[PDB]
Amino acid sequence: GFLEDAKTDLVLRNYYFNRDFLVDEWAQGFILKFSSGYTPGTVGVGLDAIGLFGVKLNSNSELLPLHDDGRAADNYGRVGVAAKLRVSASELKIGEMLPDIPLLRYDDGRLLPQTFRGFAVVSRELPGLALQAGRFDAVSLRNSADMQDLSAWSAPTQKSDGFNYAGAEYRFNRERTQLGLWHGQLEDVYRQSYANLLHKQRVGDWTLGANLGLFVDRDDGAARAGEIDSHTVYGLFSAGIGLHTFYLGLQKVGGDSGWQSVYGSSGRSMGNDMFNGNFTNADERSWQVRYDYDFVGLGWPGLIGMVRYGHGSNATTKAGSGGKEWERDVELGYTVQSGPLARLNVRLNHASNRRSFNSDFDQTRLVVSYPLSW
Ligand SMILES: COc1cc(C(=O)[O-])ccc1O
Ligand SMILES: COc1cc(C(=O)[O-])ccc1O
């Protein structure tokens, strides 16, 4: 039922951000999600809403929008609604939403999430197969209260009428393997095709995983961001045992151009994605090593750590070719497991970025999040 199965989730997010090239930002966010149930019947009808509000505290950062003078706003926010319709094992949503698909990953790396306006269909009528398609005609950046036309990261000022997509994922092999094929079009800017293989296998105490991906990009229509021709391949491999996980990522961009994506979106589909980049400049070859540990092994359940290092070379940018870069990320995340503060999450992380072709910097963040649900 519409009211029966309705859930309300509120997240309080206190976010401290520092980047030393020392500049600083501190802010408080509120993210309110109201998700109804579905009316009973052949066509079920529902409504989702999202409320976003951020407040500046005394002190990228992209935590808050900037005034024209370059001064961060005191506060910002917006409210979005989406209608939902369900039939059998298929759903259509229309309005404002948070798309999380391989060709369009909504960003939530700062204070409030990026949202999009459009429609999205998910259909699971055949066992193991999920079909998706949709179109988004406006976007609200993570650091904006407003909606604007979409554009590509490679030319953020060149606007498009919208982003269309369709894709399929098939999961099989006792749920161990998944294949994905996706096609997207940012109208008059670029078209992108993507293939993905996910696979996991247990060898004794080890869990071995692979995430292989291939993107192929070209300009579309009027080609407002210029001519584009790119392909990007990555393989991210994991080996887990007990409380430990090890990763090796390998990636290469080829062709005339870098890898394409929608401006403001997250780079997290890419194998070597890190906090401050994903090594997708034209021609760029990169590798990554990563280690994760679950500190329950030291009597600290709820505490998890990650360290990762990535290096890119052969990078072509406007300035020149043969560019090199590296990033090192470290994170400790703690989630309170029990007691009055249960579910409270504290994440502390640090990134060091060095680039032969751009500015070097270190970055420190502390994010304290508390979820309430009723
Ligand atoms: C528009 O409001 C919502 C959107 C979403 C989403 O798209 O994932 C989730 C919960 C919401 O309340
Ligand atoms: C000269 O600047 C850099 C060089 C390298 C390198 O040689 O691997 C890496 C990152 C840099 O920022």
Residue numbers in the entry: 4 to 24, 33 to 70, 76 to 390
Paper text:
In such microorganisms, the majority of small molecules are taken up by members of the OprD outer membrane protein family. Here we show that OprD channels require a carboxyl group in the substrate for efficient transport, and based on this we have renamed the family Occ, for outer membrane carboxylate channels. As expected from pairwise sequence identities that range from 35%–50%, the Occ proteins share a similar architecture, with a slightly off-center constriction formed by the inward-folded extracellular loops L3 and L7 and residues in the barrel wall. The transport data demonstrate that Occ channels have a pronounced preference for substrates with a carboxyl group, due to the universal presence of a basic ladder on one side of the barrel wall.
In addition to these new structures, we obtained much higher resolution data and more complete structures for OccD1 (formerly OprD; 2.15 Å versus 2.9 Å previously) and OccK1 (formerly OpdK; 1.65 Å versus 2.8 Å previously). As a comparison, the OccK1 pore is slightly larger in diameter than that of E. coli LamB, which is a channel specific for sugars. For OccK channels, conductance values are on average somewhat larger than those of OccD subfamily members, ranging from ∼50 pS for OccK4 to ∼300 pS for OccK1, OccK5, and OccK7. Vanillate, while being transported by OccK1, is clearly not the preferred substrate for this channel since relatively high substrate concentrations (10 µM) and long uptake times had to be used to obtain relatively low specific activities. This result is consistent with previous single-channel experiments, where the affinity of vanillate for OccK1 was found to be quite low (∼2 mM). Notably, while the current OccK1 structure contains two vanillate molecules, they are not bound at positions relevant for transport, confirming that vanillate is not a good substrate for OccK1. An interesting finding is the efficient lowering of OccK1-mediated benzoate transport by octanoate and caproate, suggesting that OccK1, but not OccD1 and OccK2, can serve as an uptake channel for medium-chain and possibly short-chain fatty acids. OccK1 is the least specific channel, also allowing the efficient passage of certain linear compounds such as medium-chain fatty acids. As judged by the inhibition of transport, OccK1 interacts with carbenicillin and cefoxitin. Intriguingly, OccK1-mediated transport is also affected by tetracycline, which is a non-β-lactam polyketide compound that does not have a carboxyl group.
